[PDB]
From a paper:
The second pathway involves the sterol-regulated inducible degrader of the LDLR (IDOL, also known as MYLIP), which is an E3 ubiquitin ligase that promotes the ubiquitylation and subsequent lysosomal degradation of the LDLR.
The FERM344 protein crystallized in space group I4122, with unit-cell parameters a = b = 159.49 Å, c = 76.72 Å, α = β = γ = 90°, with one molecule in the asymmetric unit and a solvent content of 60%. After the α7 helix, the FERM344 structure has a partially unstructured region from residue 301 until residue 317, followed by helix α8 (residues 318–332) (F3c″), which is the last residue traceable in the electron density map. In the FERM344 structure, the F3c′ is helical and positioned over the F3ab domain, obscuring the access to the peptide binding site.
Residue numbers in the entry: -1 to 302, 307 to 332
């Protein structure tokens, strides 16, 4: 009955969003964006946590009430779904929200960086929160982004770099954070917790370039691009990716997920990310998938001749007459 949604913004602020009882996910997010002054809505999504504690994206085309059936009070987290190059974001509020999202990922160690990267980033984050250097108010955060803190030895370089930023406006400092983070290898990569057969706890990253495979954010086993991935399917708690090897050999990768919703989430993450970054239009992405289905249906039609089409006759009426002529002459 004209249901209430508790939307958490990336600056930790809770919004009370009243939507129509049978409203879609797009209706929530649109009202959230209208109230935040966001025009570039298509970069955003609403994250929620399912029955099995798994983080899922709200489907903008379906009803909220169906998608979040059991789980009430309806709690949604406003998040950037599609990361693009910071300069390509035309509105300043949208840029600030990308920064809010990126700062949170950094301060939670969800994007680990080299000591050299962590020095400039720690100084830029200081300039953003407090402004130009002041001994009274100048707290830093080097430990969260990096592996270990080098104490005074590195703090002297971070206090040195924050001093070089004297004059850098809040917006500019934020833009540089976005610029540095957008250059990173794992920028715009969405990590999903899976199972390789029964053996290992693998982590799948869906990003603009393609699917990334690694065991708990370690050395990437395969940084597979999208043209290499032939097909993908979802069955229950499983995800069946059809990826082809350099020799033409189609090696079907298997992943086991915590739930059916989580398995759907990854399948949708592959289809959606590919279409967003690799297709001209949604129509084009719909076509590409359709074409791949017909193409594949015909590839199975020619994998299995005169056995089924057996005839008892050795000759036709014409052949009989000609064989009788030839037989007598020769």
């Amino acid at each position: 009955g004209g249901m209430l949604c508790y939307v958490t913004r990336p600056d930790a602020v809770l919004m009370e969003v009243e939507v129509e009882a049978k409203a879609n996910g797009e209706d929530c997010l649109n009202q959230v964006c209208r109230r935040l002054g966001i025009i570039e809505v298509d970069y955003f999504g609403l994250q929620f946590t399912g029955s099995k504690g798994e983080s899922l994206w709200l489907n903008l085309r379906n009803r909220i009430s169906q998608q979040m059936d059991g789980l009430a009070p309806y709690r949604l987290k406003l998040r950037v779904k599609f990361f693009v190059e910071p300069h390509l974001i035309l509105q300043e509020q949208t840029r600030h929200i990308f920064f809010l999202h990126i700062k949170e990922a950094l301060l939670a160690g969800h994007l680990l960086c080299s000591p050299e990267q962590a020095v400039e980033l720690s100084a830029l984050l200081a300039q953003t929160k407090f402004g130009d250097y002041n001994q009274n108010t100048a707290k830093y955060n080097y430990e969260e982004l990096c592996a270990k803190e080098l104490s005074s030895a590195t703090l002297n370089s971070i206090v040195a770099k924050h001093k070089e930023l004297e004059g850098t406006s809040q917006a500019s400092a934020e833009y540089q954070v976005l610029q540095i983070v957008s250059a990173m290898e794992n920028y715009g990569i969405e990590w999903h917790s899976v199972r390789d057969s029964e053996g290992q706890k693998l982590l799948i990253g869906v990003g603009p370039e393609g699917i990334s495979i690694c065991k708990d954010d370690f050395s990437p086993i395969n940084r597979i691009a999208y043209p290499v991935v032939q097909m993908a399917t979802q069955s229950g708690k499983n995800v069946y990716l059809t990826v082809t090897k350099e020799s033409g050999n189609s090696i079907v990768l298997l992943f086991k997920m915590i739930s059916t919703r989580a398995a759907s989430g990854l399948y949708r993450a592959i289809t959606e990310t590919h279409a967003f970054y690799r297709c001209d239009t949604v129509t084009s992405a719909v076509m590409m998938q359709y074409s791949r289905d017909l193409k594949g249906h015909l590839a199975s039609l020619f994998l299995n001749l005169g056995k089924k089409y057996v005839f008892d006759i050795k000759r036709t009426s014409k052949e009989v007459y000609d064989h009788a002529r030839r037989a007598l002459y020769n």
